[PDB]
Amino acid sequence: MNIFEMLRIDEGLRLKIYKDTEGYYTIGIGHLLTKSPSLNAAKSELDKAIGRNCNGVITKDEAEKLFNQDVDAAVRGILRNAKLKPVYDSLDAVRRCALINMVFQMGETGVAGFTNSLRMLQQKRWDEAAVNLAKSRWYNQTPNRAKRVITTFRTGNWDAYKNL
């Protein structure tokens, strides 16, 4: 299992503009287009993102291209971030994927706000950090996904994703 397979389990694939769990306009593999309520603003962002007139619909190909960019940007964002970088560097390969997943879903900023959990992951206090991470809007709003990510940080292996 790798970062791409993991994220694709968590996000799914949709070739037509759709709404987030949050109500936001998205397409592909969890590629947020706009936080704006107009389908029209969304369509315009889409065409800007793809470089063609899409009419709200993309190919598999375009979906994966957006996904490759998004994953690359998540990793780079982690590496550029003073709060995230040290935790990332301290982690093993599997747990590194769990942090990338959080950043993809919630952005650098959002994750950098989980101060206490970050501290615990650095210290390698896996059980404590899993309990702390669960105490969040994130967990309450998307509990099945948060629990997969959380188990991943807890165990250091891919079992949460075996099932799936």
From Swiss-Prot:
The active site is at E11, D20. Substrate binds at L32, F104, S117, N132. GO terms for biological process: cell wall macromolecule catabolic process; defense response to bacterium; peptidoglycan catabolic process; viral release from host cell by cytolysis. InterPro entries: Endolysin_T4_type, Glyco_hydro_24, Lysozyme-like_dom_sf, Lysozyme_dom_sf, Phage_lysozyme-like, T4-type_lysozyme. SUPFAM superfamilies: Lysozyme-like. Optimum pH is 7.3. Transmembrane segments: none annotated. Induction: Expressed late in the viral replication. Keywords: Antimicrobial, Bacteriolytic enzyme, Cytolysis, Glycosidase, Host cell lysis by virus, Host cytoplasm, Hydrolase, Viral release from host cell. One of its GO terms (molecular function) is lysozyme activity. It catalyses: Hydrolysis of (1->4)-beta-linkages between N-acetylmuramic acid and N-acetyl-D-glucosamine residues in a peptidoglycan and between N-acetyl-D-glucosamine residues in chitodextrins. It holds the Pfam family Phage_lysozyme. Belongs to the glycosyl hydrolase 24 family. This is Endolysin.
